Amino acid sequence: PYIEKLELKGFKSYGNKKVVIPFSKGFTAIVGANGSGKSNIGDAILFVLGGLSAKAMRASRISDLIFAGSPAKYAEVAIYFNNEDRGFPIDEDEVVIRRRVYPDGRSSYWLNGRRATRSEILDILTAAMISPDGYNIVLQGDITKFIKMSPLERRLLIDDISGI
Amino acid sequence: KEKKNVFMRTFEAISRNFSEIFAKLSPGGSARLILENPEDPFSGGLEIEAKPAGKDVKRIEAMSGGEKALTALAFVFAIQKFKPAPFYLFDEIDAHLDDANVKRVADLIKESSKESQFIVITLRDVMMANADKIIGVSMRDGVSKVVSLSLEKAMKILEEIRKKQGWEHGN
Ligand SMILES: Nc1ncnc2c1ncn2[C@@H]1O[C@H](COP(=O)(O)OP(=O)(O)OP(=O)(O)OP(=O)(O)OP(=O)(O)OC[C@H]2O[C@@H](n3cnc4c(N)ncnc43)[C@H](O)[C@@H]2O)[C@@H](O)[C@H]1O
Ligand SMILES: [Mg+2]
DSSP states (O other), rough: EEEEEEESBBBGGGGGEEEOOOOOEEEEEEOOOSSHHHHOOOOOOOHHTTEEEEEEGSSGGGGBBOOOOOOOOOOEEEEEETTTTSSSSSSSEEEEEEEEEEEOEEEEEEEEEEOOOOHHHHHHHHHTTOOOTTTTTTTTTOOOHHHSSSSHHHHHHHHHHHTT | HHHHHHHHHHHHHHHHHHHHHHHHHTTOOEEEEEESSSSGGGGEEEEEEETTSSSOOOGGOOOOOOHOOOHHHHHHHHHHHHHHOOOEEEEETTTTHHHHHHHHHHHHHHTTTTSSSSEEOOOOOOHHTTTTTEEEEEETEEEEEEEEEOOHHHHHHHHHHTTSSSSSTOO
């Protein structure tokens, strides 16, 4: 599968109204001045795919992800996957996952327009070979994680890829 | 036995990929993946041994930031070639690399994008130039917004960024 677009509402620096962010099936480059909000788009992806670590998304707690210019009633991200390849074990050409977090720290999830649990979301993503923290997601300043990891951690990554 | 067999097929594929890709990204250099315990791999780790200039290994700890990044990138792409992930998200992975090296990385991304989606945040023209689509981010009155950008517009934006002291990640 691949990401067709994100929809952000009340998410970090993106304001109170719904922001649509489309991607090429191939190679999309994201450019913009220092501090303009680029990495926050990556954080939207971590968030909607079930990220439980506020710190990974540079927040003290998950509610800190809610837009406050100097706030929103909650933060929400929707991610739209093209699933024509049936990578997701769902008989639909589109798989839409949505996560909303409230000021009290609780999250609601939707899968294809129906309420879902976190584990339900995680399981479908795992089946599709996608996770908030896979080797395929390289956050700012973290490319050398692959050379910093122990030889043992490095082999375990290959265990995973091999499917064993 | 059976798990060992699946592992070894995967390992040899990724190992060969890694060596080829490292040599591509660093012309004149070479690198290898090594199982700490080839007899029972599951009893040991997986090491990287690199010769950035082709003769003489350079220990990881003695590598420059650029050397570390290239080594890590060769590894990520070695996996990608064997088993393309649905998407990759790379945030300023070109820090500490000169234009020559960033171009080689960008070329590898372009080729790999036939099989996986790549989303790359970058301040580098030589990274951006052949992207299929460009998203522009800007902040006004504390709020971020995105637009779609043409290459000509994106280039002007990067020109303005490169003019300011310390634009690069890590400053
Ligand atoms: N709830 C909310 N409501 C409203 N607004 C919200 C919000 N949550 C977040 N925001 C806003 O989102 C904006 C940031 O968006 P963000 O998406 O992080 O902006 P960016 O375009 O990715 O900016 P840069 O990568 O250039 O980071 P920077 O140099 O500006 O960062 P810093 O000075 O800290 O850099 C420090 C050093 O570390 C490096 N660095 C920068 N970012 C990272 C990172 N993500 N990981 C590791 N190192 C980093 C830099 O190069 C530098 O060396 C901020 O204005 C923030 O207030
Ligand atoms: Mg950033």
